[PDB]
Design an enzyme around this catalytic site. Structure first.
Site, PDB file in Angstrom:
ATOM      1  N   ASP A   1      15.620 -14.938  -0.703  1.00  0.00           N
ATOM      2  CA  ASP A   1      16.571 -14.048  -0.053  1.00  0.00           C
ATOM      3  C   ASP A   1      16.707 -12.808  -0.827  1.00  0.00           C
ATOM      4  O   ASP A   1      17.943 -12.457  -1.325  1.00  0.00           O
ATOM      5  CB  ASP A   1      17.690 -14.736   0.180  1.00  0.00           C
ATOM      6  CG  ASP A   1      18.447 -14.902   1.643  1.00  0.00           C
ATOM      7  OD1 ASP A   1      17.218 -14.974   2.276  1.00  0.00           O
ATOM      8  OD2 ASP A   1      19.600 -15.391   1.911  1.00  0.00           O
TER       9      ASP A   1
ATOM     10  N   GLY B   1      19.316 -16.896  12.018  1.00  0.00           N
ATOM     11  CA  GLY B   1      20.155 -15.742  11.784  1.00  0.00           C
ATOM     12  C   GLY B   1      19.826 -14.413  12.574  1.00  0.00           C
ATOM     13  O   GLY B   1      18.809 -14.532  13.197  1.00  0.00           O
TER      14      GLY B   1
ATOM     15  N   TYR C   1      18.481 -11.959  11.184  1.00  0.00           N
ATOM     16  CA  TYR C   1      17.267 -11.355  10.552  1.00  0.00           C
ATOM     17  C   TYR C   1      16.069 -12.146  11.277  1.00  0.00           C
ATOM     18  O   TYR C   1      15.064 -11.592  11.507  1.00  0.00           O
ATOM     19  CB  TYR C   1      17.448 -11.717   9.133  1.00  0.00           C
ATOM     20  CG  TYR C   1      17.346 -13.220   8.707  1.00  0.00           C
ATOM     21  CD1 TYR C   1      18.550 -13.910   9.025  1.00  0.00           C
ATOM     22  CD2 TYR C   1      16.409 -13.742   7.936  1.00  0.00           C
ATOM     23  CE1 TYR C   1      18.288 -15.442   8.518  1.00  0.00           C
ATOM     24  CE2 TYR C   1      16.453 -14.998   7.598  1.00  0.00           C
ATOM     25  CZ  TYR C   1      17.514 -15.971   7.953  1.00  0.00           C
ATOM     26  OH  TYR C   1      17.670 -17.036   7.618  1.00  0.00           O
TER      27      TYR C   1
END
Ligand SMILES: Fc1ccc(-c2ncn(CC3CC3)c2-c2ccncc2)cc1
EC number: 2.7.11.24
Length: 351
Positions: free
Chosen positions: A165, A30, A32
């Protein structure tokens, strides 16, 4: 002491990890961070190793990184994501520039599990009980997840669940627009920023999830921010004077006051055929006024989890010092703090 790292490129990303981690296999990168599945020879577990991309490319990223490590480092509960290890190839703070985090590889999320249909009330009890148990722990440390949704709940083959998360990090932007799942679980007060929100925003999220597990349908799948609020008020009724007096924006109050008032609906008639204790609990979670929403700790005591509730086996967290959020440092000061946390990490003891 200092383990031996071995360089290696995967999907054009260079991974310099200790030798204990073997058979690195890309598992989705991702924005991130890049992620890999691997086998950790030292614990015997199959793990997930996330390589944060550019951890200190800005004060906000640098602070997010710091925030995430501090967060993951503190989380120690069976129902919450834990830090198995954190490391960097760098031998000095001078060359310190990459951060890797390891945690148990979670197979499927709650989506996979519900995607197929509604599940048995017994499974709804178990799964929700675990979310609230971990949430009791998370809240006890004065932390607000902020983004609880099926995709952030990892469930294993025996329906064992871990929360992950954490909101604390990302800044939900342009990702909350339209017909998107990311927004369907947000409490209204945080969705339209009516007020400064508290931990019950998470309870609202659990209620949305619980309803979906029972009906197998999304509860408030709005096509945009307004359509969703409308779907919520149709079920929960429009705000009263008590609540209205708590919404900061004179605009939000104005807007809300333009809507034809609606009464709360009968949940029994919404969730047809569901166990009455489940319906009662949903009514206590899905309350418009966040001040009056039920707490994780209180929910656990609800008669719906009689088969699983055990006050002595529902731990709270050690106090969690988040004063660093009001701290004003430079990239490099965040970097060095991050590095201190990387260097100080003490692994969870296995038997
Ligand atoms: F140390 C960490 C922390 C968080 C994540 C991590 N961040 C997100 N996800 C979900 C999927 C998208 C990878 C994970 C994750 C992936 C596989 N197994 C479990 C967790 C990975 C490693």
């Amino acid at each position: 002491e200092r383990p031996t790292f071995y360089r290696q490129e995967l999907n054009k990303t260079i991974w310099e990890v200790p030798e204990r981690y073997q058979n690195l296999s890309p598992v989705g990168s991702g924005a991130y961070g890049s992620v890999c599945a691997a086998f950790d020879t030292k614990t015997g577990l199959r793990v997930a190793v996330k390589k944060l991309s550019r951890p200190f490319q800005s004060i906000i990223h640098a602070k997010r990184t710091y925030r995430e490590l501090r967060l993951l480092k503190h989380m120690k509960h069976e129902n919450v994501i834990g830090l198995l290890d954190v490391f960097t190839p760098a031998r000095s703070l001078e060359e310190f520039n990459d951060v890797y985090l390891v945690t148990h590889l979670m197979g499927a999320d709650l989506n996979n599990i519900v995607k197929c249909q509604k599940l048995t009330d017994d499974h709804v009890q178990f799964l929700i009980y675990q979310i609230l148990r971990g949430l009791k722990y998370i809240h006890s440390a004065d932390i607000i997840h902020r983004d609880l949704k099926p995709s952030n709940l990892a469930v294993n083959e025996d329906c064992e669940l871990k929360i992950l998360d954490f909101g604390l990090a990302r800044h939900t932007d342009d990702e909350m627009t339209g017909y998107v799942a990311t927004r369907w679980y947000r409490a209204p007060e945080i969705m339209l920023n009516w007020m400064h929100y508290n931990q019950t925003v998470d309870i609202w999220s659990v209620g949305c999830i619980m309803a979906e597990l029972l009906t197998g349908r999304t509860l408030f799948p709005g096509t945009d921010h307004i359509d969703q609020l409308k779907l919520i008020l149709r079920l929960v009724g429009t705000p009263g004077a008590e609540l209205l007096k708590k919404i900061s924006s004179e605009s939000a109050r104005n807007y809300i006051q333009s809507l034809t008032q609606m009464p709360k609906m009968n949940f029994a008639n919404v969730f047809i055929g569901a166990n009455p204790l489940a319906v009662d609990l949903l009514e206590k979670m899905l309350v418009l006024d966040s001040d009056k929403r039920i707490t994780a700790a209180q929910a656990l005591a609800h008669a719906y989890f009689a088969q699983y509730h055990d006050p002595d086996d529902e731990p709270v967290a050690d106090p969690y010092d988040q004063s660093f959020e009001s701290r004003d440092l430079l990239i490099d000061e965040w970097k060095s703090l991050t590095y201190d946390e990387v260097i100080s990490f003490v692994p969870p003891p296995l038997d």
